[PDB]
């Protein structure tokens, strides 16, 4: 169920091979399958040569916590996944970004977590990995190939990312106001003031449901309903050559607009498709990605389509009583 | 807060030589140190970011290396253009802190100052002033002594000196000494002399003129 | 495209305050922290503080927490620094810069203002006198320009409206009393000068003083 979306895991041979910018959605998803995006992130920010996700690709990334509802649906996008597709940004952790306790950081080369106001990734440079606490990168000869298995990657959180329906600032302000109401004893989350409490604890691990609705910070939630709507939009399909892999942006724009390519049931239903007498000797075939759909959060008497919906560990300070 | 201890404070090297600047962070700053080159009159120009990445448009010779607390910046072959102050910057945790820079200076073959002296202008004598300007141009090294003689008698009061920065092109220094007498004081002497004590000639380079 | 345009040179009496401004353009103003760095003549830079243009939230170098107030106007892409209680130790060049990772472009960026110069002094702004230096001959010839008794910095000396730029030595303005004196020499071929007019052009904006002096021969 949690296999690849489109591409079996990579077997890179050169850690110095360039990572190409691909325009095609099915191209980019294939990179996401091969954890080429995380490898890209690492090369960009962390003095990293090579790749993570060797052999195992995205389906084998480590998660915290390890029971992880959303990883079972390969087509559910983690923060790094959305970042590759331009939907959010996983920023490079700096000194003011708290590493949540809990995860097995040891030996990890990349981990990321949603934070109260964004998404933060920690990297390690070539031939280094993380200490058990994750505070430091230290030598690790076990990573000298620069082709690292997927378990050197840690995605913190049961997190799902999707195209949002933007909400007016006043709505977010109301959600924000409900969130404060539901968590009166949380003062700061991930350094960001959440409630006003002159008097607060050291930052504590904080596991919480939350949605990113595209404003200054996420809105954390206790009692809330979620609903998964299968929307069958063209982002929910992937177009490939069953062996030659994903199709060009032109090829995939054809299939999702002209209805002349091959496709599983849902794709022919919603975009049309031609079976038999393949006009092109090498035609493409689009299929639905394995995911429950788009999540609509009901919270504070409101319904939202958020950027991300997640349950994950953040750092919160507690009010002194 | 985080101290960036940048050594050496000064380099003297010849065009072609390798230069290595070291910066030790008083605590771990990941790879979040940037290396700036700053030439006089200019703002700092980023060379290296993230400890070890050349900023875009940076020549191959500029490289940086480091993680944690030990950062090294290297010009694998210094070119005369690379006259500047270099400094690391930690941008890991606020307040971002700078290394005390490194003045890179080019060791270079010696050169006598071409000296030339300049009596007051008709315009300055009209206003009661009398500046006697002396340019000592394109010498090396920077060490140079200038003495003002009024009719053979040395003089110190009213002697203003400026030094250019080392030249980006020929790696030489250049100096301008001005001697502002009053007009009255100026009209009642004849020989005004600029005296250049420099490493090149054995006898002080001297140029002068005569007119009250 | 990308430009941090800083406000112009400033001269304030001690104890006064001064507002320096930085207009950002060519990039999404709110996506990037603005930093202010102070640099005194011949010293290294001092990081003053960062302001989050989304928030007006600021982190300061503690040495400046009371000297500077940082604000940002999203509506005009302007970061301001209000430097109060000015003494002479506040005279310096102040840079605004944004640097960091551009997550949109997916490249590091490092953008600096042109610098804004602050002189903390009660000395009166003073137009300079500008004096030709004819060499009263040999293979080359060196001319000169004396720009004398102006306050404050800066002064821009160009030779031949800037068309004469090689062989030029403009010397650091020297402060003495509370007037600056600046010197510039220019070396040209001997056949060039007496026949082709050389003129130092000197601008002292504080006094709105622009003057050209042709170095007529002796
Ligand atoms: C790591 O840094 C890489 C270098 O910037 C970056 O690749 C660059 O990504 C951008 C946008 O994702 C691409 O920008 C342009 O791409 C084409 C032009 O060929 C246009 O169609 C786009 O609209 C856009 O203007 C760059 O092409 C691309 N550069 C290279 C050399 O690949 C990676 O995305 C970065 N990775 C991470 C994880 O941040
Ligand atoms: C490693 O991958 C790279 C890129 O695919 C190749 O190595 C070099 O890459 C540079 C640019 O990055 C280009 O000059 C050439 O593509 C390669 N030149 C050399 C001298 O190798 C190559 O595919 C791999 N390198 C190996 C196998 O040594």
Author numbering:
A (entry chain A): 1 to 321
B (entry chain B): 1 to 212
C (entry chain C): 1 to 136, 141 to 222
Anything the authors wrote about it?
Severe fever with thrombocytopenia syndrome virus (SFTSV) is a novel tick-borne bunyavirus that causes severe fever with thrombocytopenia syndrome (SFTS), with a high mortality rate of up to 30%. Cryo-electron microscopy (cryo-EM) analysis of the structure of the SFTSV virion revealed that Gn and Gc form heterodimers that assemble into hexameric (hexon) and pentameric (penton) peplomers in a clustered manner on the virus membrane.
Through structural analysis, we identified that the binding epitope of mAb 40C10 is located on domain I of Gn, in contrast with the two neutralizing antibodies previously reported. In contrast to the majority of antigen-antibody interactions, mAb 40C10 primarily relies on the light chain to bind with Gn, and the buried surface areas (BSAs) of the light and heavy chains are 495.4 Å2 and 262.5 Å2, respectively. Three light-chain complementarity-determining regions (LCDRs), heavy-chain complementarity-determining region 3 (HCDR3) and light-chain framework region 2 (LFR2) together constitute the interaction network with Gn, which is mainly attributed to hydrogen bonds and hydrophobic interactions. Notably, R106 of HCDR3 forms hydrogen bonds with glycan molecules at the N-linked glycosylation site N63 of Gn. Remarkably, the essential residues mediating binding to mAb 40C10 were conserved across the different genotypes (S2A). The significantly better neutralization effect observed with the IgG form compared to the Fab form supports the hypothesis that the potential neutralization mechanism of mAb 40C10 involves intervirion cross-linking.
